[PDB]
Amino acid sequence: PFFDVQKRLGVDLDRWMTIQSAEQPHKIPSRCHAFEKEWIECAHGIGSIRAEKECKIEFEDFRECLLRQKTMKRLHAIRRQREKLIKEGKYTPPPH
Amino acid sequence: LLQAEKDRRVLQMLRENLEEEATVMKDVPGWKVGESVFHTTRWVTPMMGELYGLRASEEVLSATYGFIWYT
Amino acid sequence: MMLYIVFILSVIFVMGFVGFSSKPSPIYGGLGLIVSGGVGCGIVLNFGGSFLGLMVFLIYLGGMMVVFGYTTAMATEQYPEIWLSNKAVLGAFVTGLLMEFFMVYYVLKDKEVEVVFEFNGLGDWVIYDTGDSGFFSEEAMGIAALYSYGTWLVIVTGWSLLIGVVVIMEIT
Amino acid sequence: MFMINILMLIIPILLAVAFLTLVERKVLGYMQLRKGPNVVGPYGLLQPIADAIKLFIKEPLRPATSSASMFILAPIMALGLALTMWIPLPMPYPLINMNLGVLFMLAMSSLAVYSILWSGWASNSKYALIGALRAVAQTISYEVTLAIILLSVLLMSGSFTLSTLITTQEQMWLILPAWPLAMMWFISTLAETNRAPFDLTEGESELVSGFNVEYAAGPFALFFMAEYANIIMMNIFTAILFLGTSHNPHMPELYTINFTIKSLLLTMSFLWIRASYPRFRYDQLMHLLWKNFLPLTLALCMWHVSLPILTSGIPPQT
Amino acid sequence: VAAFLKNVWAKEPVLVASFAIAGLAVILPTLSPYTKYSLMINRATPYNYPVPLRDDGNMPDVPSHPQDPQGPSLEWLKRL
Amino acid sequence: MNLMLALLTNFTLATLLVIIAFWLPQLNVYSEKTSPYECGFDPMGSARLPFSMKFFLVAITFLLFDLEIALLLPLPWASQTANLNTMLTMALFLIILLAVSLAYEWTQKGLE
Amino acid sequence: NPIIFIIILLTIMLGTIIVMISSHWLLVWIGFEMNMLAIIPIMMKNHNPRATEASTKYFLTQSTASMLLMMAVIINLMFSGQWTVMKLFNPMASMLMTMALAMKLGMAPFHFWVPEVTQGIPLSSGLILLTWQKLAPMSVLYQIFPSINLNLILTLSVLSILIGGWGGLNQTQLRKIMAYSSIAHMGWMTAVLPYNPTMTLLNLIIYIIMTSTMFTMFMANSTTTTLSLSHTWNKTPIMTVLILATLLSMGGLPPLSGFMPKWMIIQEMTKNNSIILPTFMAITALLNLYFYMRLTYSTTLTMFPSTNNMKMKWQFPLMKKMTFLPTMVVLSTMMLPLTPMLSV
Amino acid sequence: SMVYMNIMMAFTVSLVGLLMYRSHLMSSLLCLEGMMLSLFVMAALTILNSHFTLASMMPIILLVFAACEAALGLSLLVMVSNTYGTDYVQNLNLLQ
Amino acid sequence: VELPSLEDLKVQEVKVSSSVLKAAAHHYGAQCDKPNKEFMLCRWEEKDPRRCLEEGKLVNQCALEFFRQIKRHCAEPFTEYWTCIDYSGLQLFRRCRKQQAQFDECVLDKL
Amino acid sequence: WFEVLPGIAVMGVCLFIPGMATARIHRFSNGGKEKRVAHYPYQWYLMERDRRVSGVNRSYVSKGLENID
Ligand SMILES: CCCCCCCCCCCCCCCCCC(=O)OC[C@H](COP(=O)(O)OCCN)OC(=O)CCCCCCCCCCCCCCCCC
């Protein structure tokens, strides 16, 4: 059972390493940092059981900032708009 | 000063990697010109694959791995 | 020295294992590790993390394994052997080796086949960096030294080791 | 031509490790009251061309009882990690610039003893079997004496790289301030690399001949050229980590000139000992490390930690 | 008890030199006032980039021109 | 890109030089009798290597003192901080947690 | 020696207090990683050729049990990259959590172990400490509680309370008979767990007491069933009314307190209109009773007092807190509709 | 991208027949003490390619036990083959 | 997405090495501060360095006339000053300390 | 006592090559200027810039003040 003593009295055991945006000693960010303060802002006063069916938008792109899962596919699909037609015209680019 | 040189180097860099994309093909089952892979709208620093395309010859290899393994 | 010099290490690494993940007469078990550990500390030295790579040599591969090898003279096997010579060991090997190979063959041998192996593109190291940056010791694990914020993380590890010896002063 | 800067290193050094073997018995000659190899030279300086050629003509037997797969990969090392370790070592300009490289030695100082355990085991029974086992055991207990007393000073200089370690020893020959430690930096490399007063690994007295016993002329030049590729390096190190020279952005050359007239004095120390002292009887050998060498090395670490902090001294690095 | 402390120094004068340095490095950091200088220097080294705040009304101090009178005295070190 | 050029250069002189020494006269036409006369001056030697303990512990005994002097390693980077007292008060703990771990075992090393 | 045995035996609960107190996936690794580090010497004390072929069959069976977990921690470090302790954000995490965590508790499979250790630890003293390791894991499952595939944690349950039931009917050694039917009571508390997860703890405390008061009773000399026959005509008959005032209450009959977990649990598992699940559990703990009957026909039937055996001496063990428990292991039913609203 | 499917196929090093068996236990215990580096490296990338900057110590703490503990369980493997001289997983004696 | 055209580009970048660029570099910023601190606030205060290009041509501009200033009055002591610091490795500032006055003789004085 | 003075002069010089070789390759390859060093990713960032503006492709050719007039 989760007692949460560090809430009652004053100490911090961990609570700092926890999330992707807290301090980072010299104030240097992460890559997807800016989407945390967006997504936590969403579900806080929530009780998290409606969160899943409420927010879900600010979460998904955040999952797609992290892994770049889609942008890598729409990218890999330029290799099929060009580089099947190389011989068929528009070498693209002119170098330089 | 040093930075105000870079930000111009990438915005120049996206345009050529777009304007020289949108003129490759305009396909009916293609993509709109410069859509967004996200819903949200603001400026998010681009991934290496954005700046350099499938170009992938050398000056890339001296960019990503440039700093590491040596002066 | 192409852009694939990372992908060529791991698939040696993945093949570093299957040597000792079957049954090689474990004086060659080590030689399945110090290659794997070596190439392992190889991969990590890209990406910019360095200090944290060069330690695995010092604390584990260099220091630990020798104990793993300083015994197997105490447990000493009877009359060792060159592995893969036998029919017991050799049979189990290849089907592993091909299983990534036949995977690696048509994983992408073409445009895409099919979906689950098709969402991984290759060749520019698309993600492998971002933009430029400033410098702190490097940027990343250059600052791995926290005797600031981390404390209750150390003092367990600091205390959990101190008991490591007491347990082992006995059963010995 | 970066490939011709390398091969200009590996080759010109194999002459030192060759012509050390001559100055081996001249210097150790006149301690005895006599002259050194003389008849063949005329001065003797021509001896080592004749010795390199007797071995590889002389037939290289293998024991019928050996495992040949290990009897190669092991010596095919005793000549790598000896010739790789030289790479990032400033004189003044190192061939590589490694950011944290000082740590990289311990990486290659730690990975050689795993070429002893192979060879002595690779072959056969109890003169190289349990005789190559218990020279493992002493070789790893003289690291903890080491990495600490290497780590001490590095509080007193700021970082892990070697380009800073010329800057800080400017006008202060880093041997004043920690002279208690420096001693232990010496008895270590002499205990770890299997040299005179703690001699046991290579046998003379305690056994017949340690670890060399099997190799005939064929492979045994490598070890006898490997074991002397460590000894002139740790001692070509100590003097970048203690007795510093003064870089000169103008006449780089006068840096090395005054640099080999130090590291080459320093070395002539493991020869100036070997005439002198006897051996330790392997009990006393480790039994004097935990009890005796170690407690200090911790204690000083509690000292060089505070001394910067307690003087507002803290050296300018990350 | 001082006869003890002289009758371990006729037998093992080794670790005694470690204890003698074991303490005497723990004790002193709470004594000499040179310390706490050490914490002031080490706080003032600008690893990062100072970002100018917004001034509407106060603006307690620190004008646009930096060399004008602005803020604390760090030059007690330059003379030091 | 020039490190691996400075490594595989080094081995390839070494992995060469084995064959030009070991192998070259190894196929020479001299006698080289197969007689079981080899394995010098302990002629036969038929046994297992027995377990001998005080050989063993000096393995374990090290491995643990080893770890924390990886934990102890990032002092000289951590000497540059904001609040430093959490260092000196904390840094000096590991050491004494190391040195304690001696004093106990120090009642019995045996013959080490 | 005697000091440290209280340093070790203290560090255990310090191993499991960092488990219940923490926010942070790393610590719930370190937390029950240092039990498998700090348990092992207790097994040893008399240095015999079982404990050492026991704790080594224990060791590597709690070694991977942990070391999978660290693989199912670092999955959702990829996805969402937020540690802490909450639903696992990805199905390959949980399914690699709960069915690789069932190794420490062992559930329906993953027990060829609990009888191989509990049997033949030469140390029967305790071996009461294998009631901690029931209490470390649950203090995860209560937190992760709203993520499970839900078709599993029942499928390890219902294949458990069955398989631990039949396990013992064939057993004689009575360290095993407690080993078995301690998989059983892991069938009730993790079968509930998605529905209203308190009224689990209720079954968790009532369990820690009852199995506790057994061992403290099994400590005088008692070992094998047919050494509990030589009991009543030798040691003391006031002992026998005890061992019959519990072993019956532990499978449970309504005037006792052993009936207290079921009676409440089914208030919960129906009202959710699953009435075809609980009968089969309710009805299977039945032939979980036929150990205890036929255990209890050993001691009240005056079976061949051992031999001429004359123990004229009195006792000097530590009964500590045994003179309480079977007034709280029995008589508490009349007391409490607290347990659902007390711990909650 | 691809480096996350290697190394993963590597972390099926578990393979359990070769995790407890067959004899020469030291082979089993071996593939355990190298089950790390599949846990380590895999977690030395995801931490690294995105700058967490904080959890970066975690990789260090994944060894410091992985060596400490796995070096314990070596100890028993002396007690087994002290009384025997061959480990040989084929010792079953305590039965059920 | 909206990106500006190819235009307001190809502007005049200061093209100099990285040795000279650190030669003065010092008198440079302390005395200017007209766009630049302000130009930070067009980034830190509001991100997306796309909406803010304008001062980028102001801050780039300040440099232009700066190096165009210095070429008129004294380039001779400067040209010799950034030679030593360009004699190389690390680009230390403690080797050229002697010549630091010769460059700064009349710069702090004349102009 | 003297006869050892020649014995040194072999080993000594043979270590005075490898220090003068690398020193005079770098000074020769980059034409009079010691080799740049990039320890920290900022430091690199100027070279890979300076390669672009120098004359063609290299980091060792500095433009100077008259470049921009
Ligand atoms: C307030 C500030 C702090 C104040 C502190 C005051 C001073 C304390 C500092 C003193 C510490 C000095 C170094 C540590 C002590 C020396 C090590 C030692 O303790 O040796 C003890 C050793 C044990 O011998 P023993 O106990 O008598 O048992 C044998 C009985 N048959 O007895 C011995 O004699 C062993 C001798 C050494 C063994 C090896 C010697 C071999 C020869 C090598 C000598 C060369 C080293 C010279 C240094 C060169 C430096 C460039």
Whichever domain contains C62, its CATH number is: 1.20.120.1200
Q: Is D58 helix (H, G, I), strand (E, B) or coil?
A: coil
Specify the residue for token string 């045995």: G5
CA nearest neighbour of G328 among G260, G269, G233, G275: G260
Beta bridge partners of G173: G224
Extract the tokens encoding F42.
């302990």
Extract the tokens encoding G210.
């009852």
How far apart (Å, rounded) are the C-alpha atoms in residues J21 and J31?
15
CA nearest neighbour of C74 among D141, H90, H82, D113: H82
Would you say how long chain A is, in residues?
96
3-state helix, strand, coil in chain H (%, to 5): 60, 0, 40
Specify the residue for token string 């009575």: G174
How far apart (Å, rounded) are the C-alpha atoms in residues G315 and D149?
60
Extract the tokens encoding D9.
């290193």
Would you say how long chain J is, in residues?
69
Q: How far apart are the first and last CA of chain A?
A: 65
Fold of F7-107: Methane Monooxygenase Hydroxylase; Chain G, domain 1 (1.20.58)
Angle at F50 between CA F48 and CA F53, to 5 degrees: 160
Burial pattern G315-324, b for ≥16 Cβ within 10 A else e, equals eeeeeeebee
Q: Residue E56: what are its φ and ψ, rounded to 5°?
A: -130, 120
Give the mutation target among E9, E11, E14 for probing the ligand 1 site: most ligand atoms within 8 A of CB.
E14
Say if the Cβ atoms of F82 and E43 lie within 8 Å: yes
D243 lines ligand 1 (CB under 6 A): no
- Cβ–Cβ contacts within 10 Å for residue E77, how many? 12
Interface check B37 vs A, CB under 8 A: yes
Burial pattern I97-109, b for ≥16 Cβ within 10 A else e, equals eebeeebbeeeee
Residue G328's region, left for phi above 0, alpha for psi from -120 to 50, else beta, is alpha
Say if the Cβ atoms of F84 and E38 lie within 8 Å: yes
CA nearest neighbour of G153 among G199, G197, G112: G197
In chain F, where the domains are located: 7-107
- Cβ–Cβ contacts within 10 Å for residue B54, how many? 15
Say if the Cβ atoms of E64 and I41 lie within 8 Å: no
Interface check F46 vs C, CB under 8 A: no
How far apart (Å, rounded) are the C-alpha atoms in residues C149 and C153?
9
Q: How far is CA F80 from CA E47, F74, F84, F90, H62, in A?
A: 10, 11, 8, 15, 26
E20 lines ligand 1 (CB under 6 A): yes
How far apart (Å, rounded) are the C-alpha atoms in residues C145 and C148?
8
Q: Is G186 helix (H, G, I), strand (E, B) or coil?
A: helix
Q: Residue I4: what are its φ and ψ, rounded to 5°?
A: -60, 160
Extract the tokens encoding E62.
């620190």
How far apart (Å, rounded) are the C-alpha atoms in residues E43 and E72?
13
E8 lines ligand 1 (CB under 6 A): no
Give the mutation target among D199, D269, D290, D292 for probing the ligand 1 site: most ligand atoms within 8 A of CB.
D292
CA nearest neighbour of G205 among G17, G342, G14: G342
Burial pattern C56-87, b for ≥16 Cβ within 10 A else e, equals bbbbbbbbbbbbbbbbbbbbbbeeeeebeeee
Q: How far is CA C45 from CA B65, C36, D306, in A?
A: 11, 14, 33
Dihedral angle at the C-alpha atoms of G265, G20, G210, G164, nearest 10 degrees?
Answer: 70
Are D294 and D144 a contacting pair, CB within 8 Å? yes
Q: How far is CA G260 from CA G151, G154, G214, in A?
A: 27, 22, 18
Residue nearest to atom 11 of ligand 1 (CA): E17
Are D126 and F42 a contacting pair, CB within 8 Å? yes
- Cβ–Cβ contacts within 10 Å for residue C111, how many? 11
Q: Is G283 helix (H, G, I), strand (E, B) or coil?
A: helix
Extract the tokens encoding D162.
């070697």
Interface check H25 vs G, CB under 8 A: no
Q: Is the dihedral of CA A42, A44, A45, A46 positive or negative?
A: positive
- Which chain E residues are closer than 8 Å to F84 by Cβ? 38-39, 42
Angle at H50 between CA H45 and CA H52, to 5 degrees: 95
How far apart (Å, rounded) are the C-alpha atoms in residues F51 and F57?
12
Say if the Cβ atoms of A27 and E47 lie within 8 Å: no
Which chain A residues have any C-beta within 8 angstroms of a chain B C-beta?
A: 31, 34, 38, 57-58, 61, 64-65, 68, 70-72, 74-75, 78-79, 81-83, 85, 90, 92-93
Quick one: G3 exposed, middle or buried, by C-beta within 10 A (0-12, 13-18, 19+)? exposed
Are G143 and G89 a contacting pair, CB within 8 Å? no
Beta bridge partners of C138: C136
3-state helix, strand, coil in chain J (%, to 5): 60, 0, 40
Peptide bond into F44 cis (omega under 30): no
* Per-residue DSSP letter, I83: H
Q: Is the dihedral of CA F18, F20, F23, F25 positive or negative?
A: negative
How far apart (Å, rounded) are the C-alpha atoms in residues D70 and D219?
13
What is the C-alpha R_g of chain A? 22
Largest CA distance in chain G: 72
How far apart (Å, rounded) are the C-alpha atoms in residues D169 and D259?
14
**Helix H or strand E encompassing F16:** helix F8-17
Q: Is D14 helix (H, G, I), strand (E, B) or coil?
A: helix
Q: Is the dihedral of CA G282, G283, G288, G290 positive or negative?
A: positive
Contacts of G122 (CB under 8 A, 6+ apart): G46, G48, G50, G51
How far apart (Å, rounded) are the C-alpha atoms in residues C65 and H71?
10
- Which chain C residues are closer than 8 Å to H10 by Cβ? 13-14, 16-17
From ligand 1's centre to the CA of B67, what distance in Å? Answer: 49
Say if the Cβ atoms of I87 and D249 lie within 8 Å: yes
- DSSP per-residue string spanning H45-85: HHHHHTT-SSGGGHHHHHHHHHHHHHHHHHTHHHHHHHSSS
How far apart (Å, rounded) are the C-alpha atoms in residues I12 and A81?
36
Interface check H93 vs G, CB under 8 A: yes
How far apart (Å, rounded) are the C-alpha atoms in residues B17 and I15?
25
CA distance B38 to chain A (A): 6
From ligand 1's centre to the CA of H95, what distance in Å? Answer: 58
Extract the tokens encoding G282.
């309710």
Q: Is G266 helix (H, G, I), strand (E, B) or coil?
A: helix
How far apart (Å, rounded) are the C-alpha atoms in residues D27 and D41?
16
Dihedral angle at the C-alpha atoms of G5, G6, G12, G15, nearest 10 degrees?
Answer: -120
Dihedral angle at the C-alpha atoms of D99, D103, D109, D113, nearest 10 degrees?
Answer: -120
Contacts of B45 (CB under 8 A, 6+ apart): A31, C130, C131
- Determine the residue of chain A that is closest to H58 in CA distance: A17
Mutation pick from I14, I16, I61 vs chain J, by most beta carbons of J within 10 Å, is I16
- Determine the residue of chain E that is closest to F92 in CA distance: E26
How far apart (Å, rounded) are the C-alpha atoms in residues F18 and F32?
20
How far apart (Å, rounded) are the C-alpha atoms in residues G330 and G336?
12
CA nearest neighbour of A49 among G87, G81, G340, G272: G87
- Determine the residue of chain E that is closest to D303 in CA distance: E25
Burial pattern B56-68, b for ≥16 Cβ within 10 A else e, equals eeeebbeebbbbb
Specify the residue for token string 């949980």: G94
Alpha carbons within 13 angstroms on the beta-carbon side of residue G65 total 23
Q: How many helices (H) and strands (E) does chain I have?
A: 5, 0
CA nearest neighbour of C32 among H10, F56, H16, F64: H10
Quick one: I76 exposed, middle or buried, by C-beta within 10 A (0-12, 13-18, 19+)? exposed
Specify the residue for token string 């440099």: I63
Q: Is F8 helix (H, G, I), strand (E, B) or coil?
A: helix
Q: Residue H35: what are its φ and ψ, rounded to 5°?
A: -65, -30
Final resolution, Å: 4.6
Specify the residue for token string 């959710």: G272
CA nearest neighbour of D265 among D239, D231, D244: D239
CA nearest neighbour of C164 among G37, G33, G52: G37
- The partner residue sitting opposite G36, judged by closest CB among H28, H35, H69, is H69
Say if the Cβ atoms of D8 and J37 lie within 8 Å: no
- The partner residue sitting opposite G79, judged by closest CB among A4, A17, A63, is A63
Interface check G37 vs C, CB under 8 A: yes
How far apart (Å, rounded) are the C-alpha atoms in residues D58 and D54?
6
How far apart (Å, rounded) are the C-alpha atoms in residues J25 and J28?
5
* Per-residue DSSP letter, G173: B
- Determine the residue of chain C that is closest to B65 in CA distance: C46
Extract the tokens encoding D198.
């703690």
Are I44 and E51 a contacting pair, CB within 8 Å? yes
Are D13 and D86 a contacting pair, CB within 8 Å? yes
Peptide bond into C114 cis (omega under 30): yes
Q: How far is CA I92 from CA I23, I85, I99, J6, in A?
A: 11, 7, 13, 42
Q: Is D181 helix (H, G, I), strand (E, B) or coil?
A: helix
Burial pattern D3-17, b for ≥16 Cβ within 10 A else e, equals eebbebbbebbbbbb
Angle at D131 between CA D128 and CA D132, to 5 degrees: 75
Asked if F touches D (at least 3 Cβ pairs < 8 angstroms), the answer reads yes
How far apart (Å, rounded) are the C-alpha atoms in residues D168 and D161?
12
CA distance H49 to chain C (A): 7
How far apart (Å, rounded) are the C-alpha atoms in residues C71 and H33?
14
D183 lines ligand 1 (CB under 6 A): yes
Extract the tokens encoding C28.
């060659």
CA nearest neighbour of H68 among H25, H33, H27: H33
Q: Is I10 helix (H, G, I), strand (E, B) or coil?
A: coil
Atom of ligand 1 at shortest distance to CA of D293?
A: 17
> Residue type for J17, please?
I
CA nearest neighbour of D98 among D160, D6, D10: D160
Extract the tokens encoding D268.
């002539």
Q: Is E68 helix (H, G, I), strand (E, B) or coil?
A: coil
How far apart (Å, rounded) are the C-alpha atoms in residues G158 and G278?
10
Burial pattern G268-301, b for ≥16 Cβ within 10 A else e, equals bbeeeeeeebbeebeebbeebbebbeebbebbee
Alpha carbons within 13 angstroms on the beta-carbon side of residue G8 total 21
Chains with 3 or more CB pairs under 8 A to chain A: B, C, E, G, H
Extract the tokens encoding C159.
């205390």
Interface check C156 vs D, CB under 8 A: no
CA distance H14 to chain C (A): 8
Specify the residue for token string 């190894």: F26
Largest CA distance in chain D: 67
Say if the Cβ atoms of D129 and F49 lie within 8 Å: yes
E39 lines ligand 1 (CB under 6 A): no
Q: Residue G175: what are its φ and ψ, rounded to 5°?
A: -75, -35
Q: How far is CA G95 from CA E33, G72, G90, G92, G102, in A?
A: 60, 9, 9, 5, 11
> Residue type for D153, please?
V
Mutation pick from F5, F51, F107 vs chain C, by most beta carbons of C within 10 Å, is F51
Burial pattern J49-69, b for ≥16 Cβ within 10 A else e, equals bbbebbeeeebbbbbbbebbe
Q: How far apart are the first and last CA of chain B?
A: 24
Extract the tokens encoding F85.
């007292």
Q: How far is CA G30 from CA C141, G22, G37, G71, G92, in A?
A: 22, 11, 10, 14, 22
Extract the tokens encoding C48.
């910019």
Interface check A31 vs C, CB under 8 A: yes
How far apart (Å, rounded) are the C-alpha atoms in residues F101 and F67?
13
- The partner residue sitting opposite D133, judged by closest CB among C62, C73, C82, is C73
From ligand 1's centre to the CA of D288, what distance in Å? Answer: 10
> Residue type for C62, please?
G
Asked if CATH classification 3.90.700.10 holds for the domain at H2-84, the reply, yes or no, is no
In chain H, where the domains are located: 2-84
> Residue type for D74, please?
A
Extract the tokens encoding G285.
């703990």
Residue G175's region, left for phi above 0, alpha for psi from -120 to 50, else beta, is alpha
Residue nearest to atom 10 of ligand 1 (CA): E17
- DSSP per-residue string spanning D92-126: SS-SS--SSTHHHHHHHHHSSTTTHHHHHHHH-ST
Method used to solve the structure: cryo-EM
Atom of ligand 1 at shortest distance to CA of E24?
A: 1
From ligand 1's centre to the CA of D293, what distance in Å? Answer: 8
Q: How many domains does chain C have?
A: 1
Interface check C134 vs B, CB under 8 A: no
Helical H segments across chain C, by residue range: 7-17, 29-44, 51-55, 63-70, 87-107, 154-169
Angle at G145 between CA G139 and CA G148, to 5 degrees: 125
- Cβ–Cβ contacts within 10 Å for residue A96, how many? 4
From ligand 1's centre to the CA of D292, what distance in Å? Answer: 8
Beta bridge partners of C136: C138
Are D313 and F76 a contacting pair, CB within 8 Å? no
How far apart (Å, rounded) are the C-alpha atoms in residues D37 and D25?
7
How far apart (Å, rounded) are the C-alpha atoms in residues A21 and A43?
16
- Which chain I residues are closer than 8 Å to D249 by Cβ? 87, 89, 95
Say if the Cβ atoms of D249 and I90 lie within 8 Å: no
Are G330 and G211 a contacting pair, CB within 8 Å? no
Are G30 and G18 a contacting pair, CB within 8 Å? yes
